[PDB]
Amino acid sequence: PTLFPEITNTVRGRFYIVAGIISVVMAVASIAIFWWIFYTITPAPAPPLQNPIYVNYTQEPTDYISAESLAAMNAYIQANPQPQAVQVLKGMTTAQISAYMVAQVSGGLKVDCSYCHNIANFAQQDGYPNAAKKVTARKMMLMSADLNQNYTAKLPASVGGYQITCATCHNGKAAGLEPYPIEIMNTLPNDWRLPLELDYPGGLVVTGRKDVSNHEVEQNQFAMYHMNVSMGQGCTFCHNARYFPSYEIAQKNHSIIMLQMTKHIQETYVAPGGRIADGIMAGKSPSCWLCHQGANIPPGAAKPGQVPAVLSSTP
Amino acid sequence: MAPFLMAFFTIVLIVATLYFLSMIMS
Amino acid sequence: EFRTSVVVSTLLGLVMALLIHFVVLSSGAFNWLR
Amino acid sequence: RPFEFRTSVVVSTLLGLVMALLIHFVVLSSGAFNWLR
Amino acid sequence: RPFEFRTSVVVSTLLGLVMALLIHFVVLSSGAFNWLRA
Amino acid sequence: RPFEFRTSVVVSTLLGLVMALLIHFVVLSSGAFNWLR
Amino acid sequence: RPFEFRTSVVVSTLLGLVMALLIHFVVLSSGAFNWLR
Amino acid sequence: NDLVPDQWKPLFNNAQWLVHDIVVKTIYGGLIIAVIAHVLCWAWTPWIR
Amino acid sequence: NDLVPDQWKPLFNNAQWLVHDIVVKTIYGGLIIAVIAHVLCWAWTPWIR
Amino acid sequence: NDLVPDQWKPLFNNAQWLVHDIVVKTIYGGLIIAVIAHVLCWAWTPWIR
Ligand code: BCL
Numbered sequence: 157p158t159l160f161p162e163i164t165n166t167v168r169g170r171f172y173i174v175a176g177i178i179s180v181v182m183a184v185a186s187i188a189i190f191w192w193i194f195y196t197i198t199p200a201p202a203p204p205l206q207n208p209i210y211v212n213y214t215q216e217p218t219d220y221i222s223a224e225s226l227a228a229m230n231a232y233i234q235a236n237p238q239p240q241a242v243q244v245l246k247g248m249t250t251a252q253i254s255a256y257m258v259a260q261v262s263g264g265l266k267v268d269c270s271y272c273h274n275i276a277n278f279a280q281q282d283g284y285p286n287a288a289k290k291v292t293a294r295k296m297m298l299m300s301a302d303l304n305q306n307y308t309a310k311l312p313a314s315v316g317g318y319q320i321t322c323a324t325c326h327n328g329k330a331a332g333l334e335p336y337p338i339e340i341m342n343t344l345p346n347d348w349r350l351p352l353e354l355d356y357p358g359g360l361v362v363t364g365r366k367d368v369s370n371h372e373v374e375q376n377q378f379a380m381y382h383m384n385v386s387m388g389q390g391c392t393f394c395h396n397a398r399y400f401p402s403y404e405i406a407q408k409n410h411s412i413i414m415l416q417m418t419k420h421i422q423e424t425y426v427a428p429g430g431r432i433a434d435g436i437m438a439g440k441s442p443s444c445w446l447c448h449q450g451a452n453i454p455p456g457a458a459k460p461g462q463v464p465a466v467l468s469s470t471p
Numbered sequence: 472m473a474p475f476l477m478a479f480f481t482i483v484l485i486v487a488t489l490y491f492l493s494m495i496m497s
Numbered sequence: 498e499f500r501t502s503v504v505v506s507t508l509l510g511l512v513m514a515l516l517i518h519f520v521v522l523s524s525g526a527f528n529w530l531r
Numbered sequence: 532r533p534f535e536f537r538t539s540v541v542v543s544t545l546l547g548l549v550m551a552l553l554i555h556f557v558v559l560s561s562g563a564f565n566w567l568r
Numbered sequence: 569r570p571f572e573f574r575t576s577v578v579v580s581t582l583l584g585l586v587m588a589l590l591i592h593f594v595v596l597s598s599g600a601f602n603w604l605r606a
Numbered sequence: 607r608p609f610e611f612r613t614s615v616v617v618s619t620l621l622g623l624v625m626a627l628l629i630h631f632v633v634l635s636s637g638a639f640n641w642l643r
Numbered sequence: 644r645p646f647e648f649r650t651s652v653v654v655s656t657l658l659g660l661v662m663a664l665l666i667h668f669v670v671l672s673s674g675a676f677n678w679l680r
Numbered sequence: 681n682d683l684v685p686d687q688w689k690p691l692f693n694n695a696q697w698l699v700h701d702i703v704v705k706t707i708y709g710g711l712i713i714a715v716i717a718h719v720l721c722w723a724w725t726p727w728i729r
Numbered sequence: 730n731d732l733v734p735d736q737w738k739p740l741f742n743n744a745q746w747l748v749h750d751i752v753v754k755t756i757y758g759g760l761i762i763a764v765i766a767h768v769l770c771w772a773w774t775p776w777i778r
Numbered sequence: 779n780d781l782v783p784d785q786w787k788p789l790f791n792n793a794q795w796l797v798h799d800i801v802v803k804t805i806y807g808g809l810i811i812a813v814i815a816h817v818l819c820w821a822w823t824p825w826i827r
Pocket residue numbers: 173177484487488491492
């Protein structure tokens with residue numbers, strides 16, 4: 157007894173039931189098997205990184221140390237309880253200065269102790285072929301202190317209390333730094349650089365000016381896309397797209413302070429009256445990507461209270 | 472105890488499907 | 498219909514094979530091709 | 532017959548060419564063989 | 569017959585030309601032969 | 607006959623002209639001959 | 644005949660004019676003759 | 681449908697029998713090869729552990 | 730379909746048999762060449778390890 | 779199709795036989811030249827090493 161003779165009596169209509177059941181089973185099986193295979197052979201997505209000083213930067217593998225400088229380190233420290241012939245690092249003992257050198261100076265550059273100053277007598281100044289490196293390091297420390305105490309202190313406590321250290325700009329390389337690498341020059345012309353000769357409180361304003369045209373807007377767009385790439389948050393990170401001139405997102409004033417800081421770095425250290433003479437950094441202009449490296453907070457930034465108080469924003 | 476219940480419902484579904492197919496396919 | 502079943506089976510097999518090889522290669526859990 | 536010889540030949544040749552091109556390009560990009568520098 | 573001579577000739581000639589151009593371009597861009605100023 | 611004389615002449619002439627232009631441009635752009643400054 | 648006189652004349656005239664204009668433009672852009680400053 | 685068995689005649693044709701047999705043999709061979717390859721991969725490197 | 734074998738008569742045409750034979754021979758030759766190339770490449774540098 | 783051989787009559791026309799011969803000769807010459815060029819380039823600079 158049936159109510160559908162055309163479906164439960166004839167072979168042609170009787171085949172459709174099995175066909176549909178097989179189709180459903182095949183679809184379910186294929187979906188389940190693909191997703192099981194995908195979720196079984198994939199690594200753990202997000203491994204957190206913890207480091208008591210750096211923000212997403214590491215120096216624990218220290219194979220770059222020759223292991224004999226560490227041997228002389230303890231002998232020096234035992235010989236002299238207090239530092240001798242120190243001109244910048246003040247208020248610290250030899251043990252604290254050695255810890256700073258091991259973790260910060262060598263951790264941030266990935267170089268041996270003999271790179272800058274002699275292991276035999278750590279207090280020597282110009283008796284070895286590496287005195288110039290130590291002088292450049294002292295100038296770097298003074299520059300870092302200036303940058304910390306003049307610009308980072310203006311940012312609100314909401315952003316945090318991160319400081320600037322060697323690893324912020326070096327990121328594990330002694331030399332040959334690459335501001336404006338090829339991977340970040342994707343959509344832009346290959347020879348574009350930040351316009352560091354303008355006054356940024358009004359440098360890149362184009363809205364309704366009527367004394368500019370599409371070329372100035374193009375330059376503004378190049379700068380804005382560079383600012384996007386140096387982070388990973390898109391064009392709305394500092395803006396409201398309904399009205400660009402508005403100051404309401406609270407990361408646009410931070411960008412103003414950052415721009416003024418970059419201009420100061422360009423005009424005081426990169427090339428004061430000539431990049432070749434009287435200028436550290438070998439004539440390399442600064443960039444947002446140099447420190448930020450595609451993140452809101454630079455990976456080389458140090459957590460609050462980590463750097464020495466002499467170099468801190470609040471000495 | 473979730474996998475045991477999953478097996479139970481799957482077995483019940485298979486048995487019901489086979490029984491109704493045999494009823495129709497005869 | 499025989500033709501529709503053959504076509505569906507062939508495309509499904511090809512797509513699954515390509516997707517699974519790509520996923521396995523991107524996983525980097527087998528030491529295959531460096 | 533459900534399918535023609537012409538369609539079968541066309542599909543087979545297109546699939547073979549595409550597969551060969553894909554495999555050469557992937558092996559070249561893997562950088563696992565030291566081929567062409 | 570499954571295919572005409574004209575279609576076979578056209579497909580073969582086009583495939584040969586495209587493959588020759590592609591191989592020449594790839595070898596030139598590889599920079600592994602020191603040809604035409606390295 | 608599978609092809610006409612007109613079609614063969616047209617295809618050959620277009621291919622030759624395009625290839626000559628491409629080869630001259632590649633040779634000029636490579637800058638390996640010291641021709642035209 | 645495969646081709647007529649009209650088509651040959653048109654094609655030859657167009658090809659000659661295009662080639663002459665292209666050659667003058669390339670020579671002017673090269674900046675190797677001191678022509679037009 | 682002379683070659684087709686009496687049971688499957690209403691659904692099939694003469695050539696569809698042959699094509700179906702070819703497809704069945706191809707599926708069986710592919711399944712055997714896949715089983716062998718999977719066993720070899722498991723012996724080389726387990727994925728469940 | 731005089732030349733076509735008896736069992737394949739309801740599937741093939743007389744002119745298509747020759748093209749199919751050519752395709753089969755080409756596939757066999759390509760398969761042999763591919764086997765030789767794979768053996769040489771494995772002898773050069775293994776890819777599974 | 780007087781010139782076409784007995785086996786190839788169902789596929790070829792008398793006019794296409796000559797064009798096919800021309801194409802075959804051209805392909806053979808091209809393969810010979812390609813072999814010579816490949817040997818010369820290998821003698822110049824190996825691409826596998
Ligand atoms: C996990 C605990 C969950 C919950 C999970 C579920 C789920 C899951 C389901 C129900 C369903 C129902 N739930 Mg409950 N339920 C909960 C709490 C409650 C409460 C309550 C006040 O707390 C109430 C009043 C109910 C009441 C109900 C009923 C309305 C219903 C079960 C009886 C029925 O409909 O039989 C009448 C139904 C039948 C006679 C169907 C019999 C079908 C047979 C077995 C055949 C199957 C298909 C067969 C293989 C096809 C063959 C032929 C093909 C051609 C191949 N649930 C809690 C919150 N409940 C079930 C349901 O049927 O909902 C509609 C259901 O799926």
